[PDB]
């Protein structure tokens, strides 16, 4: 397999369906990354999380640099050896979770592009993002701007120092971060600044922040089409299956979220007729799986009744099953919606998926 | 199958290795079962403890009469159907874990003999356990006979009431329980009673409830032989594996404890070089398994290094990755007990083992 490579197999306006081949596997996209946030996709055996149809998964970096630090993985083998999982990982930057300064960010420690980029090395991480500054909403245009700008020179730094390292740059992916808060001028500048450095990825940053979803589409409406259409387009923290479905439509191919694992651990069922609420006594007798069509192995062998004295009791099992079946229902979503996008009908698919979820 | 028949393959001593066959699965014995609190083996799936080699558990009728209700769990078709574990299950009265009268007990409702019985049927437990009381530890003889005698008393009721159920006496077995104390004649008539009414199987009560190692063995030495030989005897509560080892050589078929589970998620772990405490710094670069020579799927796959991340950080899968060892490990105990038995040669097993364990 190549150390990169994105193929587009097949499109419906804006929305893409293909391949992204790297050295410890192929990513089918669009693309939903189950999180790992301290090296465990929480109460899930990585076994599971591929069982369920996850080709890739996204490791945070900020707790693990903590404990048990970047260097004592490195020691023991890298991520992938350490917990299990011989698939490709995504690593965030750190930052994001994170005394700001144009060198970095301090805190209760230093962080900067360099170390940034240098932590995901040793982690071993295959699509490593650059370090950037998610600019607070709402922003005004000037400090949107100033932020920007800030982030794109962190950008080139990121390019620099996962270049001037060869067994990163030989066998991993590097991914630029769009700024500009909902301003299509900073979009545009951004865009281009980011495609002048060169990236094999570029992903949507700034959104996902409290806007809304109405003005998260709206900008990317007019953000997406500013990146370069060959290389996939990542939409950071997003999000809710609806969240998912409109940012296909408006040119999305990878896509990360804790909703489907925190909130199943919270209670939280997501189904085709939309999320329920499992712990609510209306469950406390029904024999019925947590949803009708599912396939994955909980629904295949436990009630609602079951899971909802599970959770109500603060079972562990009821956390392992709840996040099982979320992370497998984000996956049909995907695999429907990339079926439907290979078949032309994509569009019929998200009105149908709207009509009944809502 | 029959719905209960137990026969004895080999001897060594009063050692004893052989099979409890009932309609629902055999049971190897020597027999270590998984305890199972609210209708879960905490942080296990059935299939993961089938998986270990574990034969039938014991499901804890006290969280479960209280939530969901008994009432409700025989609604949703029994306990084995709500929790998808279709082996046997051996049902505890409840009583253990609980305004005291002969006619039962009140605390914050009433249980008795009769109530007991009932609601391990709505559960619809394979063994049952007659309702008895666990005399405190230590006891003046006087208090010791009174208690014994009253639960001699609930036994008769017990069997009774179960013998008034048809669906129960046709597919369900009875345990009756000794109790006495430390107290030689006490046990004695407790056995004696127990036999005149006749039961399936016989459990030593009374034990593991702060004597000590010492003084539980010596009681064991006089107890045990005086209950029928011809059917299986179970010490309720133990143990650590020392104590399994050594109430086998004194003739116990079978065993139940939440050592193994409760102890894996604070972060025991058993090998067979004695407990270690995974959380213990010295393990955090330590890139061996839990235990050298475990067949188990963790031993297999992860790291001491990383189950002491796992656990220091707080995470699920910790719990699940050190309750799957060590009820593994607890299988792989009887394993090697019945074979040793099975080849006479346990009595140098028995050696062998705490040589090494200590
Ligand atoms: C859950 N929402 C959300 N998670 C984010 C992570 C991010 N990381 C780097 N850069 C971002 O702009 C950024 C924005 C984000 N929004
Ligand atoms: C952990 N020790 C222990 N768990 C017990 C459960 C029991 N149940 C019924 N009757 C008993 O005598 C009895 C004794 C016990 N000791
Ligand atoms: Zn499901
Ligand atoms: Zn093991």
Request: charged share 25%; with cysteine.
């Amino acid at each position: 397999r190549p150390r990169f490579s994105f193929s587009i197999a097949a499109r419906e306006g804006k929305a893409r369906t293909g391949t992204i081949e790297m050295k410890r596997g192929v990513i089918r996209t669009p693309a939903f990354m189950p999180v790992g946030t301290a090296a465990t996709v929480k109460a899930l055996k990585p076994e599971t999380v591929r069982a369920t149809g996850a080709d890739i998964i996204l490791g945070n970096t900020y707790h693990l640099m903590l404990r048990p630090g970047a260097e004592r993985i490195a020691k023991l083998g890298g991520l992938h050896s350490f917990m299990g999982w011989d698939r490709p990982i995504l690593t965030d930057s750190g930052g994001y979770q994170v005394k700001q300064s144009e060198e970095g960010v301090t805190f209760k420690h230093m962080l900067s592009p360099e170390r940034s980029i240098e932590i995901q090395h040793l982690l071993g991480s295959d699509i490593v993002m650059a370090f950037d500054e998610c600019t607070p909403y709402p922003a005004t245009p000037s400090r949107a701007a100033s932020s920007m700008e800030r982030s794109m020179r962190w950008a080139k730094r990121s390019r620099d120092a996962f270049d001037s390292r060869k067994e990163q740059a030989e066998n991993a992916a590097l991914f630029g971060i769009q700024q500009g808060s909902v301003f299509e001028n900073l979009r545009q500048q951004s865009a281009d600044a980011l495609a002048e450095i060169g990236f094999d990825g570029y992903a949507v940053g700034g959104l996902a922040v409290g806007e809304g979803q109405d003005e998260m589409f709206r900008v990317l409406d007019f953000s997406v089409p500013m990146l370069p259409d060959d290389k996939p387009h990542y939409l950071m923290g997003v999000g809710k299956p609806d969240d998912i479905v409109g940012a296909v439509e408006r040119g999305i191919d990878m896509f990360d979220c804790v909703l489907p694992t925190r909130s199943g651990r919270n209670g939280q069922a997501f189904t085709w007729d939309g999320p329920i609420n499992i712990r609510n006594a209306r469950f406390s007798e029904d024999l019925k799986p947590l949803d009708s069509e599912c396939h994955c192995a909980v629904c295949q062998k436990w009630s609602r009744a079951y899971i909802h004295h599970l959770i109500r009791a603060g079972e562990i099992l009821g956390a392992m099953l709840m996040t099982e079946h979320n992370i497998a229902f984000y996956q049909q979503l995907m695999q429907k919606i990339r079926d439907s996008i290979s078949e032309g009908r994509f569009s019929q698919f998200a009105q149908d998926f709207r009509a009944r979820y809502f």
